[PDB]
Amino acid sequence: THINLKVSDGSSEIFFKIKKTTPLRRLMEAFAKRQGKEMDSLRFLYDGIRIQADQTPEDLDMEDNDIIEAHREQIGGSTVVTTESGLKYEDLTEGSGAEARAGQTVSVHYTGWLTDGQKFGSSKDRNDPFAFVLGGGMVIKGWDEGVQGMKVGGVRRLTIPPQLGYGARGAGGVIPPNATLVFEVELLDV
Ligand SMILES: CCOC(=O)[C@@H]1CCCCN1S(=O)(=O)Cc1ccccc1
């Protein structure tokens, strides 16, 4: 009557036990919400086929310990850029207006995760935007570099190697030495 399912996006892996007659909506919402996102930002595939919120394990002939693969889809497309430092960035949404430049004070919202999907931080927790002088050395190097060129309204995903993050030290009782960090940064003002 019930099966176990694993949902993975390549980083976060979440395990669920679900009645076979239960629609996949709750499971899908749960996975999305754990990344601080709305369900409609993701696409969930079973056996290469896209799952819809109203379908059940029964409708799809799912078995115990099956896997659902989760991906974000941007309708715009996906282009990930590697810079000379080894920083990677992907504009999920492009903003409007002038590009943020070195020396400007910027205000952003962000969420940060480890490569196992664990959230270590977010400005949305206290609903308090984060401000800093871009290129001023008051944030990790991945940020001083990666927020350059964003426009207001833009959402940019940064993949930050540890020499551009917290290096050998880690941070916050959460990020260990030599960790790669993933942030989604939204530029609010420049
Ligand atoms: C004040 C300097 O902070 C930073 O440079 C980065 C980027 C700018 C915003 C905050 N972070 S943090 O989330 O990684 C900080 C963090 C790390 C580990 C656990 C919690 C928070």
UniProtKB/TrEMBL annotation:
<feature type="binding site">
    <location>
        <position position="190"/>
    </location>
    <ligand>
        <name>Ca(2+) 2</name>
    </ligand>
</feature>
<dbReference type="InterPro" id="IPR046357">
    <property type="entry name" value="PPIase_dom_sf"/>
</dbReference>
<dbReference type="GO" id="GO:0046872">
    <property type="term" value="F:metal ion binding"/>
</dbReference>
<feature type="domain" description="PPIase FKBP-type">
    <location>
        <begin position="103"/>
        <end position="190"/>
    </location>
</feature>
<keyword id="KW-0413">Isomerase</keyword>
<protein>
    <recommendedName>
        <fullName>Peptidyl-prolyl cis-trans isomerase</fullName>
        <ecNumber>5.2.1.8</ecNumber>
    </recommendedName>
</protein>
<keyword id="KW-0697">Rotamase</keyword>
<keyword id="KW-0479">Metal-binding</keyword>
<dbReference type="InterPro" id="IPR001179">
    <property type="entry name" value="PPIase_FKBP_dom"/>
</dbReference>
<feature type="binding site">
    <location>
        <position position="128"/>
    </location>
    <ligand>
        <name>Ca(2+) 1</name>
    </ligand>
</feature>
<feature type="binding site">
    <location>
        <position position="129"/>
    </location>
    <ligand>
        <name>Mg(2+)</name>
    </ligand>
</feature>
<comment type="similarity">
    <text>Belongs to the FKBP-type PPIase family.</text>
</comment>
<feature type="binding site">
    <location>
        <position position="128"/>
    </location>
    <ligand>
        <name>Mg(2+)</name>
    </ligand>
</feature>
<feature type="binding site">
    <location>
        <position position="129"/>
    </location>
    <ligand>
        <name>Ca(2+) 2</name>
    </ligand>
</feature>
<feature type="binding site">
    <location>
        <position position="189"/>
    </location>
    <ligand>
        <name>Ca(2+) 2</name>
    </ligand>
</feature>
<comment type="function">
    <text>PPIases accelerate the folding of proteins.</text>
</comment>
<feature type="binding site">
    <location>
        <position position="128"/>
    </location>
    <ligand>
        <name>Ca(2+) 2</name>
    </ligand>
</feature>
<dbReference type="Pfam" id="PF00254">
    <property type="entry name" value="FKBP_C"/>
</dbReference>
<dbReference type="GO" id="GO:0003755">
    <property type="term" value="F:peptidyl-prolyl cis-trans isomerase activity"/>
</dbReference>
<feature type="binding site">
    <location>
        <position position="129"/>
    </location>
    <ligand>
        <name>Ca(2+) 1</name>
    </ligand>
</feature>
<keyword id="KW-0106">Calcium</keyword>
